[PDB]
């Protein structure tokens, strides 16, 4: 099934905004090819996750990208947009 995800690229650093609710199946492959495309053509030096604070699956996605290799970034970072109603994780390349 075709899946639409909102993702925005700026300043050579990619930002992914996840919508509320659970994920559809085959999403593993989805973020997989998301990273493949993040490296091959657009050549990102850093990938980033952002999602709304008030949800019952905050810990779920946090631990998800935790296992995926993402690390927590404190709001207020120069590369992070000033928005205190969002949680942020980060994965850096070499």
């Amino acid at each position: 099934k075709r899946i639409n995800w909102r993702t925005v690229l700026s300043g050579g650093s990619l930002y992914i905004e996840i919508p509320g609710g659970a994920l559809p199946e085959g999403s593993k492959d989805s973020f997989a090819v998301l990273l493949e495309f993040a490296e091959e053509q657009l050549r990102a030096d850093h990938v980033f996750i952002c999602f709304h604070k008030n949800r019952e699956d905050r810990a779920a996605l946090l631990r998800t990208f935790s296992f995926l290799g993402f690390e927590i970034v404190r709001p207020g970072h120069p590369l992070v947009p000033k928005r205190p109603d969002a949680c942020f994780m980060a994965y850096t390349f070499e």
């Binding site: 604070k53 995926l68 927590i72 070499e94």
Partner: protein
């Protein structure tokens, strides 16, 4: 890189209290204390329970140079999750035959690096990663990652069949099966299911003509004795009959939280206080060594209990560590003790936490010392870095 001696007359209490004493006037920063003796004791516990399984420590739990050094000294393998990790491990002087990468989502640069460094054993849980594996490293050794019946990860039996078929077409060698059984799970029968799935591969790959010689069982261990005891009480009767010694079986495990979680203790300082029930602010929080709260009890240093909430120095709404606790009236400048601070509490110093990292203090007992000395470990060349006193 310094660990102090401890006799029966001395305890952790006095090194904690002394570090408190000296930090009170100086930097005023938090402090970490790690018991390597309990890691060694857990290695002896492992060898006691099951010795025919080689543990491969997940670095993401603790990536401090000291722990990695003593673990490499113990002969324990390494489970990798990043290329910087692999860089540090390879820089230490570890053999590539005892290195495994674990990240559920691999990248092209990472696998090119893995290919360049000579590490062939790696896991996989989808067709895309298999495709890039075949695309860049034709001589890679593949471990199939399966799912468990406990948001999602792993590969279904049918898709595992498709995976081994494609792998056969892509001329890449599959050697074993990979999975993870969480520490929290107590449902024994579950393991059977997992193992049954592995048996499936043992058949299917066996039918396709590939050689199997390794089984990875994961890293779901709490650290306590009874947990591992139940683990063997379930795994041992079934394992020896399906893969006995001499069948060419090399079983592998990947302990992470197991060795270090309850092995570390954190000493923290108070910087703020507010009366509404009370709310108290520390000089550290979730944005640092307290990520593990997302997935354990404080004690008072000094000699009337009130309910209170814990906040960090970031003061933002997300910096809640404990929802409700009971403590006597305190003021700014007091100390707090946190046990079980080993699981995912060590991160690298950067702008993420204002270039601030807690000090590194290590503890060792005489008993564990003679326990390592008689094992013939202290005399080999790989530990020229050690400094103990």
């Amino acid at each position: 890189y310094s660990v102090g001696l401890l006799d029966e007359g001395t305890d952790l209490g006095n090194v904690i209290d002394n570090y408190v004493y000296e930090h009170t006037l100086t930097g005023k920063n938090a402090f970490f204390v790690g018991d390597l003796g309990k890691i060694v004791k857990k290695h002896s516990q492992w060898q006691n329970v099951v010795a025919q399984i080689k543990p491969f420590y997940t670095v993401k739990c603790n990536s401090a140079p000291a722990v990695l050094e003593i673990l490499a000294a113990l002969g324990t393998g390494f489970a990798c999750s990043s290329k910087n990790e692999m860089a540090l491990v390879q820089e230490l002087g570890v053999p590539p035959e005892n290195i495994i990468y674990i990240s559920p989502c691999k990248q092209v640069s990472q696998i090119k690096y893995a290919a360049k460094v000579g590490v062939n054993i790696l896991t996989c849980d989808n067709e895309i990663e298999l495709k890039k594996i075949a695309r860049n490293h034709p001589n890679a050794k593949v471990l199939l990652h399966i799912a468990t019946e406990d948001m999602k990860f792993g590969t279904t039996l049918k898709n595992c069949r498709h995976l081994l078929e494609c792998a056969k077409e892509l001329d890449v060698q599959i050697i074993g099966v990979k999975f993870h059984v969480s520490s929290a799970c107590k449902e024994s029968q579950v393991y059977v299911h997992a193992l049954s799935d592995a048996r499936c591969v043992f058949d299917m790959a066996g039918e396709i003509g590939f050689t199997m010689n390794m089984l990875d069982i994961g890293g779901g261990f709490t650290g306590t004795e009874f947990q591992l005891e139940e683990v063997n009480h379930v795994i041992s009767p079934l394992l020896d009959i399906y893969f006995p010694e001499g069948s060419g079986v090399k079983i592998i495990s990947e302990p992470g939280s197991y060795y270090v979680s309850s092995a570390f203790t954190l000493a923290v300082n108070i910087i703020a206080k507010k009366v509404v029930a009370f709310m108290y602010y520390m000089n550290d929080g979730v944005y640092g060594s307290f990520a593990s709260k997302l997935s354990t009890i404080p004690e008072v240093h000094k000699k009337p209990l009130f309910t209170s909430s814990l906040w960090g120095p970031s003061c933002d709404e997300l910096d809640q560590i404990v929802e409700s606790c009971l403590l006597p009236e305190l003021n700014v400048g007091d100390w707090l003790i946190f046990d079980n601070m080993g699981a995912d509490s060590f991160h690298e110093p950067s702008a993420f936490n204002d270039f601030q990292r807690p000090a590194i203090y290590y503890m060792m007992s005489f008993s564990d010392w003679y326990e390592m000395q008689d094992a013939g470990i202290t005399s080999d060349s790989m530990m020229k870095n050690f400094f103990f006193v």
